[PDB]
Every structure is written in C-alpha cells, then in structure tokens.
Amino acid sequence: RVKKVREMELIYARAQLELEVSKAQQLANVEAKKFKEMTEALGPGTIRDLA
Amino acid sequence: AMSMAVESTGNAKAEAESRAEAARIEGEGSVLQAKLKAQALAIETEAELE
C-alpha cells in the first residue's frame, strides 16, 4: 500500500513537476521574445544614450 | 508445609496458566485478524488507487 501510493504519486508528480517547467519555459520565451521585439525596435544605441 | 506449598503453587500457577492460555487466543486471533485486515486494506487501497 505505502509502496504503490508513494510510487504512483511519484510518476504523477513527475509528469507534473516537468509540466511545471514547460509552463515556465514557454513564459520565458514570450518574455524574451517581447523583450527582443522592443529592444531592437526602440534602438540598440538609443538605450545607451537614454540611460 | 507440603500442603502449604502445593496450595500456593497449584492455585497461583493455575491463575497464571489461564491468562497465558487466554493470551494465546489473542496471539492466534491477531494473526488471523491481521491476515484478514491485509485483504481488507488491500482490496480497499488498491481498488481505490484507480
């Protein structure tokens, strides 16, 4: 019982802890993508002089 | 004094013999009960695992 409850919870938590990383992976892409679409569209040199 | 000896031993041991004999029933009973409890929890915890 204690084997097949923690072991079956492990394979369940495995496919959820890795599902958690895919969420953060795709959200990191749209962040860096939308960051790239602004930093170059604004100006590679303009960011330097503005600060 | 030989009657005093067989009085104390025969009486006190017979009381201590019965409680040990009763404890044997709990021991053999608990084995069969735990064996039945295994199936009870097995069918419960395994079938509910689905």
Swiss-Prot record, chain B:
Full protein name: Major vault protein
Function: Required for normal vault structure. Vaults are multi-subunit structures that may act as scaffolds for proteins involved in signal transduction. Vaults may also play a role in nucleo-cytoplasmic transport. Down-regulates IFNG-mediated STAT1 signaling and subsequent activation of JAK. Down-regulates SRC activity and signaling through MAP kinases.
Subunit structure: The vault ribonucleoprotein particle is a huge (400 A x 670 A) cage structure of 12.9 MDa. It consists of a dimer of half-vaults, with each half-vault comprising 39 identical major vault protein (MVP) chains, PARP4 and one or more vault RNAs (vRNAs). Interacts with TEP1. Interacts with PTEN and activated MAPK1. The phosphorylated protein interacts with the SH2 domains of PTPN11 and SRC. Interacts with APEX1. May interact with ZNF540.
Subcellular location as annotated: Cytoplasm; Nucleus
Domain notes: MVP 3 mediates interaction with PTEN. MVP 4 mediates interaction with PARP4.
Residues of the whole record sequence present: 711 to 760 of 861
Post-translational events: Phosphorylated on Tyr residues after EGF stimulation. Dephosphorylated by PTPN11.
Signal peptide: none
Organism per entry: Rattus norvegicus (Rat)
